[PDB]
Amino acid sequence: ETFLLYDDCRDTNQSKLAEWLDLLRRRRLKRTNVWPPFKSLATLVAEFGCVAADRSNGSKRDAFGFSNVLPLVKIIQQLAEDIRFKSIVNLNGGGELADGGTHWDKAMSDEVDYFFGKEKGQENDWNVHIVNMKNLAQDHAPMLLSALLEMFAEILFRRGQERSYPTVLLLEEAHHYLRKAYERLAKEGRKFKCSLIVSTQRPSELSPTVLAMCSNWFSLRLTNERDLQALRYAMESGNEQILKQISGLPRGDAVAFGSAFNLPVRISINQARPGPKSSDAVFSEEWA
Amino acid sequence: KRELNGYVFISEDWRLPALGSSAVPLTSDFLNIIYSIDKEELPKAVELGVDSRTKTVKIFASVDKLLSRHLAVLGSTGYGKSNFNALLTRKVSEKYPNSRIVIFDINGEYAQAFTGIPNVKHTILGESPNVDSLEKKQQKGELYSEEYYCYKKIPYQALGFAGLIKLLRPSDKTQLPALRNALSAINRTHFKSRNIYLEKDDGETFLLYDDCRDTNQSKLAEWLDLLRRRRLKRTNVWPPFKSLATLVAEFGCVAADRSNGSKRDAFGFSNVLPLVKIIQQLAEDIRFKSIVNLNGGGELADGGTHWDKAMSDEVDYFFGKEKGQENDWNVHIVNMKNLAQDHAPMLLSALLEMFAEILFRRGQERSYPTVLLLEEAHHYLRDPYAEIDSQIKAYERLAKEGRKFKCSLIVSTQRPSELSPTVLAMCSNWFSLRLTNERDLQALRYAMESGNEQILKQISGLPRGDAVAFGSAFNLPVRISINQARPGPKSSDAVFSEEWAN
Numbered sequence A: 001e002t003f004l005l006y007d008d009c010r011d012t013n014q015s016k017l018a019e020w021l022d023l024l025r026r027r028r029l030k031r032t033n034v035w036p037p038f039k040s041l042a043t044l045v046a047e048f049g050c051v052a053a054d055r056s057n058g059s060k061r062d063a064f065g066f067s068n069v070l071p072l073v074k075i076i077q078q079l080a081e082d083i084r085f086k087s088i089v090n091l092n093g094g095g096e097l098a099d100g101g102t103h104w105d106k107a108m109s110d111e112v113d114y115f116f117g118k119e120k121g122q123e124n125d126w127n128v129h130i131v132n133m134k135n136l137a138q139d140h141a142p143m144l145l146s147a148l149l150e151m152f153a154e155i156l157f158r159r160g161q162e163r164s165y166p167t168v169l170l171l172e173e174a175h176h177y178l179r180k181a182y183e184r185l186a187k188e189g190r191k192f193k194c195s196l197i198v199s200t201q202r203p204s205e206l207s208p209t210v211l212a213m214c215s216n217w218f219s220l221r222l223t224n225e226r227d228l229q230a231l232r233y234a235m236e237s238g239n240e241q242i243l244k245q246i247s248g249l250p251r252g253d254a255v256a257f258g259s260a261f262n263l264p265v266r267i268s269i270n271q272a273r274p275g276p277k278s279s280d281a282v283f284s285e286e287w288a
Numbered sequence B: 001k002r003e004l005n006g007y008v009f010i011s012e013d014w015r016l017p018a019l020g021s022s023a024v025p026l027t028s029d030f031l032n033i034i035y036s037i038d039k040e041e042l043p044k045a046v047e048l049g050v051d052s053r054t055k056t057v058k059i060f061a062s063v064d065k066l067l068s069r070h071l072a073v074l075g076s077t078g079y080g081k082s083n084f085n086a087l088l089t090r091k092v093s094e095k096y097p098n099s100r101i102v103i104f105d106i107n108g109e110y111a112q113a114f115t116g117i118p119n120v121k122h123t124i125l126g127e128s129p130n131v132d133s134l135e136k137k138q139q140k141g142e143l144y145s146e147e148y149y150c151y152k153k154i155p156y157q158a159l160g161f162a163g164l165i166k167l168l169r170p171s172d173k174t175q176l177p178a179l180r181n182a183l184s185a186i187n188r189t190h191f192k193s194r195n196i197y198l199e200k201d202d203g204e205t206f207l208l209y210d211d212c213r214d215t216n217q218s219k220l221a222e223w224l225d226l227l228r229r230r231r232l233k234r235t236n237v238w239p240p241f242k243s244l245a246t247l248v249a250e251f252g253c254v255a256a257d258r259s260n261g262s263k264r265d266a267f268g269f270s271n272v273l274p275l276v277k278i279i280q281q282l283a284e285d286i287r288f289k290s291i292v293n294l295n296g297g298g299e300l301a302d303g304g305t306h307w308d309k310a311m312s313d314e315v316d317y318f319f320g321k322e323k324g325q326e327n328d329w330n331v332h333i334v335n336m337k338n339l340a341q342d343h344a345p346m347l348l349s350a351l352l353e354m355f356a357e358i359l360f361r362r363g364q365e366r367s368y369p370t371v372l373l374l375e376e377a378h379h380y381l382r383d384p385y386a387e388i389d390s391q392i393k394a395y396e397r398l399a400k401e402g403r404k405f406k407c408s409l410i411v412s413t414q415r416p417s418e419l420s421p422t423v424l425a426m427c428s429n430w431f432s433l434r435l436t437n438e439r440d441l442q443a444l445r446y447a448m449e450s451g452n453e454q455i456l457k458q459i460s461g462l463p464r465g466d467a468v469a470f471g472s473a474f475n476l477p478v479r480i481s482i483n484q485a486r487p488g489p490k491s492s493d494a495v496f497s498e499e500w501a502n
């Protein structure tokens, strides 16, 4: 037998709803072997929110609960129809769904082995990974980029200090998507053998703990007092004589200090070959 | 120091002179090396003014550095902020006559300043006071003179499946699904003088009503399921803004008697009534209807592609055509003299989203450079009834898409404290005139990069015409005296004495 659910508070077959819906909670009816799509959450939400008890010894579809559940189905619907979200995320399902009760923890643990690599002993086909995100909007980035760093921390714990391999993580423009549990990778990283490089221009938008869990420092020019004060309040290994130099540094010159330098240094940095694209724009050409 | 047979200036502060060395003053040959630009950029420069303290040295800047990125102009009232923008925009054209400049003018000032330049246009937003009057088009290569202009409305097709939802705000039980079913089916309703109906594949027709009258209330179910699952006949004309209100009621006042045969019940109809009220209110008005065209007319070419072409055609009118095609004008002035403080955000924060969407598609191969000037942006860059940052999502997208696909922004304003501090951080150059308060002079401190304090502590006392500049196009900051424009903008707002004397 079958039964068909809807998204609108229509009156068709609104008597035998609870009889079918209680078995769902008590896990007595059938299950499947394929992942469904994303839009299919709104129907379940509406049905769990718009069911009531009828006086005609049956069930009823109410409308004073739709008014309670409505604000959520709305954003779900407006999110499953954007043309900049579905080109990054795959809102179609169709894949295999396992048994046993462990179907989330096998989906989570298959996108980490693709970006951050596998564990010790196995064969991997690369040592350098370059992820490019030029096609991702500037308003969907925080969520989707924090999700990944929250996923890469529930798994080092379940992997351990034995099966884990040491890696290096280059994070560029980190003040857009690095800010309780949202920053566990910067704290519980030394145990699980991960090291971060953070590049950024607005250090006043970071947490004073991330900028304090750092051992060595490389500082180029920095012209704002709202940032100098932060660097100073968080600094642990230096002085206040090299802080005055940071505002009059030319290009390529840097100030360096930490544990790998026995006395702070002013440095001129070698050029790289082949270098990064770092191209620019030119308007005069196209119209001249 | 010397380079080959000239000199060059380098900024770095760790050096010092030796004891006994002699001090000497500086001349107009070294000042003109301290306040100059490279040789690589000299054939692409633009003049702005002269130095204030001495007045023997002229100031130049490079179009590339200055405009490839975004730019900000700040200043109080009555100190010289509208002369600067006309100077700049006219000097860009006089040097690069194949440019593309678009201006949002919400006061009607910037037309008197382009008299004498080719490929100018002038569009007003609204309806003609007179009706049986003419408007004279111009040809190519013809110098602009006033008495040439055009009028324009904006249709309602170019707001999409989402703009209308946002503009109507269904806030209760059973308004949303009906308002979706109506927008999804608006392309199968036919129209006559003053009544709406459907047309079957075979002659037969069936009428729709808006008052819940029980005449012929027994065939709804089977004349609605078909419309719902794409079985009735199509059409080829856009209907008005009231078929919406006529469908939202017949989709919300329907039920089924246990005695087979449908009935248009009365109770459910009330659950939808208020939306019908307001969507009626927005036709017997003088403000919304003066700007927007809620009448209905045009082609509706089949192919499930009737929401996109309206956007694509309305963008090519204000912002320009794709590369290769023939676009007539090069300067576009849009006049919003007649537009209320209530419908400004909603209307002017949708053309920009359109432009973003189309500029994401055009790409780097089909996109043409353009400069876009936004005046008094503290009026429409923040949707007031959007009180969470979850809803400010237009500038943050358009700035990036433009920095990628050749679109430059100029933001002019006089109150930088009513303006989010992420709008003023995507900028790479700054021009500031006198600021009188003390809470608008901290929003700049908090959000600037390439300055200092000795150039900021002398903004409270800047006279009329003098400015202060810094950013990634200046080697060291400058205090500067700007030069007058000829001809300039207009300022005729109101004067009492005259009328009182008449």
Ligand SMILES: Nc1ncnc2c1ncn2[C@@H]1O[C@H](COP(=O)(O)OP(=O)(O)OP(O)(O)=S)[C@@H](O)[C@H]1O
Pocket (backbone or CB within 6 Å): B075, B076, B077, B078, B079, B080, B081, B082, B083, B464, B465, B466, B481, B482, B483, B484, B491
């Ligand atoms: N270099 C200059 N020297 C002296 N006066 C100037 C100079 N440049 C502009 N002015 C004068 O400044 C006066 C007022 O400038 P406006 O154009 O009203 O600036 P504004 O009021 O900030 O612009 P809005 O926001 O459009 S009213 C004009 O009457 C000009 O004559």
